[PDB]
Amino acid sequence: MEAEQVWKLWRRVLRDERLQAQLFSATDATHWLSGFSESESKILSVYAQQFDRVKWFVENYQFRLVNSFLNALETGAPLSLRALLHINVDLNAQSKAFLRDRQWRDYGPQVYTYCEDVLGFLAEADELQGYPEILDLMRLERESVRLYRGLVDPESLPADNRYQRTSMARLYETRFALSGWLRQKDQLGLTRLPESTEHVLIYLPTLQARHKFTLINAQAARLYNCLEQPQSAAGLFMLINSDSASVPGSADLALLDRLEQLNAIRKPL
């Protein structure tokens, strides 16, 4: 009985709750399905006695995973969590619903990957379809998760002759004026927001600090959206999407100076 085989067995039992109904209800030797492999059934036959402890090893695994659904929310989307707790959603009823679709998956230390799948799951829940302002706030939080995850092993671009867009900052074009909730976090999910698009820039001051939110002009959003690929050897001023063929100063240069301070772009040094 190798230790690696008794672990693979329980990893299969904890993720398949159909197998849990067979083991708990039927304690007789051959009543539990002999579809368990011959090597598996030998390990189950050791647990023939003290099956109550097995029913206690589960639930504990499920109670911890349901609570981990809240940690992944507090880690990746603390504002979305505070808004959802204010509108009184049964996150326990949603933790069980989300984990069952994933076969009770143990995300482990992959908390941002956990949170990104959680925010995508809640974006389709019928309970949240009536709160578009929170649905907008969750997408903003989902970009914060993609900011951290994009910095694990990013493509290191050397400083050269063209304006480069750094990976320590992302941009989100909102649907509502989410600044009202960011400036007044006591109103998270409680008050009402207008339907005016904003340009919030999720960025990081240092690589070992909490990410920040800040608003930029539509012009600054044009400077950032035209740097998807670093085609910017003075062509950035030519790249106003044919709306303008002008190369300006101060009007456009001061915006690029602020974007570098926010670690959003890299100037040609």
Partner: protein, 295 residues
């Protein structure tokens, strides 16, 4: 550094598990040392950060006033995944180095790139698992740069395929790897009541007590027969007997007191906190016993 030795006796301390709850009843200056759960302060592995930036300022406040120990939970140290891939070397090893911790404890379970599946799975007591886990513990200690102790575990069923007892397993494990031991006395007391034939006396005689670096004194409860090791009840007297008995046979380096999680810690538990002196009088008793056997 090439081979680590037991640090000098450093004193008694508290676990510092309740972040907001324990600093308010902080008493005098006699604590000197507290523990730090490395899992609470670690940042996600799918991100670029090692420590939670909120916990970065808290460690600065306490690293100056008190010595802060390391504790490795949910680290997947003794799993089957590659050691380089585990959360131990990726987050827990730099965290203990960032904390300037003298040594680091580590629970004795199983973990493969997943947390919350660690508990209720003691390592298979077999010479095959002794050789495998000692190779990992000896290499993991090299990366820590500090002594690595293993906390004894309390459970309800030993892993299927056990070829020896827990005391023989831990003795053969630290002898081959050269690591140390972290003696949780309430886990020893729990295994005595809830396991068929757990010789409490043979367990103490079999362990290399000169490998015990740290000691843990905690208290759990049970009512009807279901769950235990809640880490909440007052330190029971049979555990106090082991604390006085251990200090007469070996010389540890520190002793910490575990207590409950602030919310639940199990499927059904309580969170009321009006018996703060129940902990203060426990730290007073364990601190006076240390001076009775003080070197």
């Amino acid at each position: 550094m090439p081979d680590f030795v037991k640090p000098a006796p450093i004193g008694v301390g508290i676990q510092y598990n309740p972040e907001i709850l324990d600093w308010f009843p902080f008493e005098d200056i006699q604590v000197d040392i507290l523990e730090i759960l490395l899992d609470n302060i670690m940042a996600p592995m799918d991100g670029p950060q090692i420590i939670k930036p909120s916990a970065q300022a808290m460690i600065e406040r306490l690293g100056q006033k008190f010595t802060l120990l390391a504790h490795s939970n949910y680290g997947c140290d003794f799993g089957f995944s590659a050691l380089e891939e585990t959360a131990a070397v990726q987050r827990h090893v730099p965290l203990a180095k960032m904390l300037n911790s003298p040594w680091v404890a580590n629970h004795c379970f199983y973990g493969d790139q997943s947390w919350l599946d660690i508990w209720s799975s003691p390592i298979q007591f077999s010479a095959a698992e002794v050789a495998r886990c000692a190779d990992r513990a000896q290499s993991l200690q090299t990366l820590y740069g500090m002594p690595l102790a293993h906390e004894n575990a309390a459970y309800y069923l030993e892993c299927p395929g056990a070829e020896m007892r827990e005391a023989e397993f831990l003795a053969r494990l630290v002898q081959r790897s050269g690591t140390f031991l972290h003696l949780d006395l309430h886990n020893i007391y729990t295994n005595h009541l809830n396991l068929k034939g757990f010789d409490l006396k043979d367990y103490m005689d079999t362990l290399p007590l000169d490998k015990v670096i740290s000691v843990h004194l905690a208290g759990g409860s049970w009512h009807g027969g279901l769950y235990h090791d809640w880490h909440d009840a007052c330190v029971p007297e049979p555990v106090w007997d082991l604390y006085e008995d251990l200090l007469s046979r070996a010389q540890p380096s520190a002793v910490i007191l575990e207590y409950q999680g602030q919310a639940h810690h199990a499927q059904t538990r309580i969170m009321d906190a009006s018996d703060e002196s129940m902990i203060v009088r426990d730290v007073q008793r364990a601190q006076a016993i240390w001076s009775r056997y003080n070197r």
